[PDB]
Every structure is written in structure tokens, then in C-alpha cells.
């Protein structure tokens, strides 16, 4: 539940938000897309599993973790995206083609949105293009994200949190530097005003020899979190792999329905055929001789048409969309 | 298609940092001087000048390569084996035998020797590529000869193998805006271009 430097926040410009998209995956054959952000979904303040609410990074100086509900998150590329699942950093959703992806938490009027470019296209399987998996059709081998939230496409390494500095922790008065930690908290301070000097202060503390607040830094001693190895955060020196969390929604194999193209009408002439064709959508015709040359030909077809294909005594084979191969022999 | 991991940056903001050598795939790293990066407080350093930064990046297989991945094969002399059904007199038999003129097929009272083929043939070129059951007669580069933006830009003995070798032609650029970040540019996944 850290924050990343999203390149496109709500208004127009980059800024540091809890909802930064860091990577996006769309290899699933149904068009479902997996996303990863800095927020922890399905989790309350302490991290206990609960789907109805999520925790995320706060916009304050004590900078705690604050929570919201599933109703208030929306995702969209061109039209709104429908959520399919969420665990921690990761999301899975199905939604129409577009050029960029956006995730928005709508806390009332506080609608915070992060957008990142990703050219997502309507992708199909089989040899016939289609908007929609048909009700009737061949069941062909496809690979689709598993909606099971306890799966694992892999694993991701996270580390101890890095620096998190503040100048609200610092205070300037009469050209002099003080540190004001939050109540009851031991905050680690470090400065250089000539000599470089460090320390930890738990209360309102003076420093000497310092006139500019830019020369000193303060930050809470937080190791109670694990943060992904993100490039938007300056890191801890001990960046050892301090954990490994699974990548839910594994890309599992299954079977998908694909349509059955038009059954062609063959019109034959001496050592050659004239095949009459109908395909409202892009349909792939692949032909090949069966001799010492294949002479393989391929074509994506829309509308209706007619194709003249010479057939020799040795024979010819063709596949029209997802239909089965058909083989012929001239006389 | 490779996943470009860009580790979290590092700053020694009035000391010095140098370029260490790792064993990661197409490992790239470089050093900048005065940068003075901001993260959320508007300043993450003291001694704003002479502010060395270590910027790094490398690549791995994607977590989804477990399904979508191509494997490169060198084929050799094509051994041909035939299943055969015969009938003689009244009795019939099924048997599977090689065509070499050496290997005999047998059915329990019958012996037969088959081959060699009258005219040898193999539809497979010496260099082939397999992806999800689809075969291509593609001349893939030899192992270790990765080329950026070309097929086989990323190579490894196996998906779980740790000897990931790559030359993706990545180069890391100097940061410009005051906010902390790592800018870089990378060549397109040659796997995707071949796809």
C-alpha cells in the first residue's frame, strides 16, 4: 500500500498517487487483462483478507494507510471496465479495446484517477474473426486467465520500505531547524550543516548550526511494511529479497467456442475448381498442393467472392476457417 | 517476450557510486552526477550538488511465458515409421515398423523387413521453431547470438533456468524532471515482431 509516480493523474499532469498502474498484461485469449498497482485490494488496515474493502496509501504527513470499498473503484479504457477480480496489487478485468487504461477511486467528490498508455486490441482465436464467441461452434484449444483468485502465474519479490522524507517533520523558525515527530513516534533525523550528523528524536527537537531546512531530513523508522521493488521509490540499502508473493489469475488452458464459416460451393472445370465463398467476417482460407511443391496460399476474406484454384492429378488440400481439411484429386 | 525489470534507484547524494557488474540478462547500469531528485516532500537529499545516482535495469522471461513461448529446435535425419495392416489368405495382422531395410516388424508368426524409402524426404528445415503446437521453418540465431529486435533476442536453456541471456539494446537516459524516476529506452520485443 505504497504510492507511485503516475504519469497521468486526474487533472493532466504526473503526480504521486496510491493508484499508479505499473504494468499491464493482456495475453489472455478472451480479452481479459491483468493490471498491477501499489494498492492492496481485499485487505483491511491490518491486512486481513476481506473482499468488500481495501487498504491504500494516504495523503498526509503521518502518512498512514486508509481504506475504502469495492463499489468506489472503477476501471476504464474506452468504456467502463468491469472488474473480474482483485488481490493485493493485482487486478483482472474485461473491457473493450482502447489505447490507454485508467483506474479511479471515487471517494465522493475525491475522484483520483491514474492513466497509463497500453494499446489493447480485440483479440479472437481460430481462423474466423468475431466480435463474440458464438453459441454454436467448434470447441478449440485456447488459453485464458483463470478467474480463481488463489492461482499463481508466478511470483513477485518485495523488500523493506525505502526512504520517506518530509518537511512537515521539519520546522523553520528564526532561521533555525527543528524536528516535530508525530506524538509518541521515534523519527529518524539526519542533517549536514557543515559536519554530517544523524540521530533519532521522538519529540520536538532543536538542532544547532543549521539555518536552512533544505540541509536536514527526517523520516519515521518504518520497517513494518514490505514494498514492491518499484522504480518510483528511492530504495533501502539492504535491498535483499525479503518476501515473495504469488501472481494470482494464472493463464490456464481451456477450450473456447469458435464459429463455423460458410460451407463453400465448388464449381469444377478441367483440372481446376471454382470455389464460391461467403464470410461476413475475416475468414482464413489456406490452400496447398500435395506434390513436391506445396505452393501454399493464404487469404483473409470478407464478403462473398469466387476463387479459381488449379487442381492437378496429384491433388490439392484446403482449409476454410475452422472447418476440417478437405482433399481432392484431379483426373 | 521479455519483461523489463527496472530496479529501484539509488542515490549517494554527496559521495560517489560506481558501476558494478552483475550476471543478469542484458544487465545495464550507469552513473549520473548532480540530479537532486524529489519523491513526495520536494527534496530527498542534503548536499544538493555532486549528487551521484546509480541507475540500473535488466530483463527476464515474463510470468506468462509458461504458456506463450517459442522453443528452438535443430532437426536431424527424419526417421519414418509406418503402421501397417495386412491380410494374407484368411488371416490379417497389424504391426508398426521402421523403413530402413534393417529393422524387422513382427506379428507372432510373421516377419517383414521394410525399406529404405525409394526417395528420401523431410519437410522440416534444419532450423525449426515450435510455439503452442505450431511449427515454423525459421532460421533462429544460434544460442548466445542474441540480436536486439529479432527473434531469439531472449534465450535460456529452460523457462525455469537462471542463465537468462539477452541483448535487447536497452539504454538508460539521464533524468530530466526534478521528480525521482529512471528514464530508459528499449528495443521492441523481437519475439513479438516475429509473432
Amino acid at each position, epitope marked *: 500500500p505504497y504510492l507511485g509516480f503516475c504519469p497521468y493523474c486526474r487533472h493532466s499532469a504526473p503526480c504521486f498517487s496510491p493508484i499508479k498502474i505499473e504494468n499491464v498484461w493482456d495475453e489472455s485469449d478472451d480479452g481479459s487483462i491483468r493490471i498491477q498497482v501499489s494498492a492492496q485490494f481485499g485487505y483491511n488496515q491490518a491486512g486481513t483478507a476481506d473482499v468488500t474493502k481495501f487498504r491504500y496509501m494516504s495523503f498526509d504527513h503521518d502518512h498512514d494507510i486508509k481504506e475504502d470499498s469495492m463499489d468506489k473503484i472503477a476501471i476504464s479504457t474506452s468504456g467502463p471496465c468491469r472488474r473480474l477480480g482483485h488481490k493485493g496489487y493485482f487486478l483482472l478485468a474485461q473491457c473493450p479495446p482502447g489505447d490507454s487504461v485508467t483506474v479511479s477511486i471515487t471517494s465522493g467528490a475525491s475522484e483520483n484517477s491514474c492513466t497509463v498508455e497500453k494499446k489493447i486490441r480485440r483479440k479472437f482465436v481460430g481462423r474466423e474473426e468475431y466480435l463474440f464467441p458464438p453459441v454454436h461452434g467448434k470447441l478449440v484449444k485456447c488459453h485464458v486467465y483463470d478467474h480463481l483468485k488463489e492461482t499463481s502465474a508466478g511470483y513477485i519479490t518485495m523488500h523493506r520500505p525505502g526512504p520517506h522524507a518530509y518537511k512537515s517533520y521539519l520546522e523553520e523558525a528564526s532561521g533555525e531547524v527543528y524536528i516535530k515527530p508525530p506524538s509518541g513516534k*521515534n523519527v*529518524t533525523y539526519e542533517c549536514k550543516c*557543515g*559536519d*554530517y550528523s544523524t540521530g*533519532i528524536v521522538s519529540t520536538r527537537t532543536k538542532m544547532n548550526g543549521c539555518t536552512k531546512a533544505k540541509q536536514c531530513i527526517a523520516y519515521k523508522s518504518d*520497517q513494518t511494511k514490505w514494498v514492491f521493488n518499484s522504480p518510483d521509490l528511492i530504495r*533501502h*540499502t539492504d535491498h535483499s529479497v525479503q518476501g515473495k508473493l504469488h501472481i494470482p489469475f494464472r493463464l490456464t488452458p481451456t477450450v473456447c467456442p469458435v464459429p463455423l464459416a460458410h460451407t463453400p460451393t465448388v464449381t469444377k472445370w478441367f483440372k481446376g475448381i471454382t470455389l464460391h465463398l461467403t464470410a461476413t467476417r475475416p475468414t482464413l482460407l489456406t490452400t496447398r498442393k500435395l506434390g513436391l511443391r506445396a505452393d501454399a496460399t493464404a487469404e483473409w476474406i470478407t464478403g462473398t467472392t469466387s476463387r479459381n484454384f488449379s487442381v492437378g492429378r496429384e491433388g490439392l488440400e484446403y482449409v476454410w476457417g475452422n472447418h476440417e481439411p478437405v482433399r481432392v484429386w484431379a483426373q | 517476450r521479455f519483461h523489463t525489470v527496472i530496479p529501484s534507484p539509488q542515490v549517494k547524494c554527496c559521495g560517489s557510486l560506481e558501476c558494478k557488474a552483475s550476471s543478469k540478462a542484458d544487465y545495464t547500469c550507469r552513473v549520473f552526477g548532480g540530479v537532486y531528485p524529489f519523491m513526495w516532500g520536494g527534496a530527498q537529499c542534503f548536499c544538493d550538488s555532486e549528487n551521484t545516482q546509480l541507475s540500473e535495469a535488466y530483463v527476464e522471461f515474463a510470468p506468462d511465458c509458461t504458456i506463450d513461448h517459442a522453443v528452438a529446435l535443430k532437426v536431424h535425419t527424419a526417421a519414418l515409421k509406418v503402421g501397417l495392416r495386412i491380410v494374407y489368405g484368411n488371416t490379417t495382422a497389424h504391426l508398426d515398423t521402421f523403413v530402413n531395410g534393417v529393422t524387422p516388424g513382427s506379428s507372432r508368426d510373421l516377419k517383414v523387413i521394410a525399406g529404405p524409402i525409394s526417395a528420401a524426404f523431410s519437410p522440416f528445415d534444419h532450423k525449426v521453431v515450435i510455439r503452442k503446437g505450431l511449427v515454423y521453418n525459421y532460421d533462429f540465431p544460434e544460442y548466445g547470438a542474441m540480436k536486439p529486435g529479432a527473434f531469439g533476442d531472449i534465450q535460456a536453456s529452460s523457462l525455469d533456468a537462471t542463465d537468462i541471456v539477452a541483448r535487447t539494446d536497452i539504454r538508460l537516459l539521464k533524468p530530466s524532471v526534478k521528480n525521482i524516476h529512471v528514464p530508459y529506452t528499449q528495443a521492441v520485443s523481437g519475439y513479438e515482431m516475429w509473432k
Partner: antibody
Amino acid sequence: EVQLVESGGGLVQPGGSLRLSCVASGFTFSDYRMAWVRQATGKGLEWVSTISQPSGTNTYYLDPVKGRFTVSRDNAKNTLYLQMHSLRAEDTAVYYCARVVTESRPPAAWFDVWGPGVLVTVSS
Amino acid sequence: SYELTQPPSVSASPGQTARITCGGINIGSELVHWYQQKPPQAPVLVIYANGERPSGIPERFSGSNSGNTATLTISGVEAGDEADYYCQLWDISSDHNYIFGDGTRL
């Protein structure tokens, strides 16, 4: 070559005084913090004092050695110094001058270069 | 003031791995450094910042830190490893003091 060489140790009566010296070579003496560390015979390492860089404005000492021992530096001749007053019997030990390599974040300091050390004895 | 405890001795023939533990309250929240010493020679740093090493340290040496325990792990012990080892840290909230461990012998 980076080298630290101590000198000035020896025998002294309790309540006496001494000036231990450490000449430095092979590096920029002004660029690094220095420290005096101590080891009694058969015992572990115990930190004595640290002097900052380049001017050594702020100096830190172990609790019993405050007020009696004072660490100083000279960047011109590249020399660290520790003056001891009111010496006591258990001050008897081998003292090493050691560089301090410190990193701004997380505040963490360690000793990369150590001198061979020199023996001071406090006995009657 | 943090207190560091290590076992007074650890016994290991050559060939296997040896673990030496530094104990102290909440030391996993700080960065530990292990120094190796052969008396009368000066101590040499072998681990710093819980996870890395100076140049020239063989690949067998490794360090870890978590909670109430830090650990120096030395795979494939040899005769030359027989030495003394000090845990150390820099507690700065106690006036920039450098606490060393009691020491352990291999």
C-alpha cells in the same frame, strides 16, 4: 596504498597523561571521519571516540572516557590524535585508529581501514 | 542501549556450513556488521548492512538479520575460517554509540 600507523603508546602511571598519534597515508584525510577503538587483552572490541570531517567540529566519546580523553585531527599533516588525562588501570589496552565509512541513509557507519594498533599500559 | 549476545564458541569441522547468531532486542530493525579477527591482527569487516560484503570476501560468506536475531552463515568451512567474529551495530539514539557483540570462536 591506504595505511594507518599508530605511535606514542607505552607505559604510564595511573593519573598520568599521554598523546597517542595516528599518521595516515594513501587517501584524502579530510574527506573521512576517523575513530579510536580499543581492545583489552583477551576482550572484545570497544569503541572509544569518533571525530567528524573535514574540520572535525562534532566529536563523540564513550561514556567513561568523556571529560578525560579528547580526540583531534590535523588535515595538513594527515594525522589523528587522542590526548588522555587522568589515566586508569583498565585503560591498559591496544588502541587502533580506524576510518569510519558512513552512509547518509539509513544512518550506518563501519570501519573499513584499521591501523595495526599500539599498546598503552596503565600500572603502578 | 542495545545488548548484543553471541555464542561463546561454535564447533565445525571443514566441509559444512556454520551459523553464528547475534542476539539483541529488535535488532532486525537495524543494520548489523560482522567483523572477523585473528588476534593479534586487527579485525576485518566481512558483513555490513545485513546483506553485503567488502571486495575480496569469498562467495561462501553471507549475512542475514530479522527480528531478534542476526546470522552469519559460512558455507563450506575450512581451517582458515577458525577465527573470532564480532557482531556490531551503531545505535544512534544512545548518543551515537557503537555496540559490539561478546564474540564467537570457530
